[PDB]
Symmetry: C2
Subunit: 226 residues, 2 copies
């Protein structure tokens, strides 16, 4: 049948990101695979238009929620959306800096998931650490998942980036995942997805290449009285 | 001799909250105890001024980070701040509703910690579930702890409140904890404090009485250090 049964195989993915920042256009293409049982996977991304005009760091979350590792007591909404598919409407607001707004669609073709993302990054500080490429690491974080009506789940996160000058650049992440289909789908109750990410420069062309690894797994926390 | 050493026994605390919401003043007083190794404690709170003019739920975080339970390998800043103590500046912004800003000061006296808090709850919706007292549960959540430069730690949280409708009202919690002393205090690496909270009514004669339990413990998530 559908949902998690479609993810019971090694999978591949391809992502096409159509973006702009402060009016400068860019294109990123990324691909990779995720081996069953998922939860730990790599992606290789390339800026097709040459040099990325901003830090690659804030792009980390654009470069597959359905590859997170879930325990059986929590419905894995992102996988349950297949085969009809998944759309995401996401905004990351960077403190003292710009806002990135992304619209994602995800389609499954046999064992390859194709992603299309359009992203607008508005109001980024030309002399800030994103535009000057001064972000170094991405902090592991405990994203919060909430039910959001009949066919959607909301993921809220605090994503901190360490910077060359020691202060954190904090992103406020707010992401609505919506099922493309019309059957009833199980909506998980409140829970958490732990996300650990690392991005590394790859040998660079006339184009920026980056390799990225992500570890992602869900858990819950029981209520009182206990 | 200072810091965590001062939390190796059972302790008590006492809290004075001087508040208002959309003009209306209120005062709360609360106390309780926390027994070693901490991480699970109750507070009894009373609105001295009569009936609380809003839901008690949003007050949960006003009514003791030094009583969270930490494992060995994460520095416990809120305890590390003693004997000199610490202050907090905190904003909770509620979606489609008001914002509460508070300023807390903590002082140790033997094995009691005293807290004084002023809080302004501005812009709350008269028709909303906070003012109309329609919030029922407080969702357990994974608060994020970050070093915040010399002498300070930042705690960020998404704190959901289930409404009577069976909907959700999200508070965006942003809290700065600052050491009040003058020596060179260490600051913890990024980590999390899991917080589970339950409020329960006590029979209100003259004044609103609320009893609140909290489970709070820290953990860290390691970063990837291998290449590829
Ligand atoms: Cl351009
Ligand atoms: Cl590629
Ligand atoms: Cl700046
Ligand atoms: Cl690198
Ligand atoms: Cl709002
Ligand atoms: Cl831990
Ligand atoms: Cl790891
Ligand atoms: Na949008
Ligand atoms: Na939209």
């Amino acid at each position: 049948e559908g949902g998690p049964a479609l993810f019971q195989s090694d999978m591949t993915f391809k992502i096409f990101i159509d973006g702009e920042v402060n009016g400068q256009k860019f294109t990123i293409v990324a691909d990779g695979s995720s081996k069953f049982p998922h939860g730990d996977f790599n992606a290789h991304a390339v800026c097709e238009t040459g040099k990325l005009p901003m830090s690659w760091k804030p792009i980390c979350h654009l470069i597959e929620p359905f590859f997170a590792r879930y325990p059986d007591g929590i419905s894995h909404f992102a996988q349950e959306c297949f085969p009809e598919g998944l759309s995401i409407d996401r905004t990351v607001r960077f403190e003292n800096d710009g806002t990135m707004t992304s619209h994602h669609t995800y389609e499954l073709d046999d064992t390859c998931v194709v992603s299309r993302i359009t992203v607008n990054c508005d109001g980024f500080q030309p002399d800030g650490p994103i535009m000057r490429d001064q972000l170094v690491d991405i902090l592991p974080n405990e994203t919060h998942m909430f039910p959001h009506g009949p066919n959607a789940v909301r993921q809220l996160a605090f994503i901190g980036f360490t910077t060359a000058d020691g202060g954190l650049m904090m992103g406020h992440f707010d992401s609505k995942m919506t099922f493309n289909g019309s059957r009833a789908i199980e909506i998980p109750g409140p829970h958490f997805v732990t996300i650990i990410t690392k991005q590394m420069r790859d040998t660079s062309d006339k184009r920026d290449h980056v390799c990225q690894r992500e570890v992602a797994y869900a858990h819950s926390v029981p209520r009182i009285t206990s």
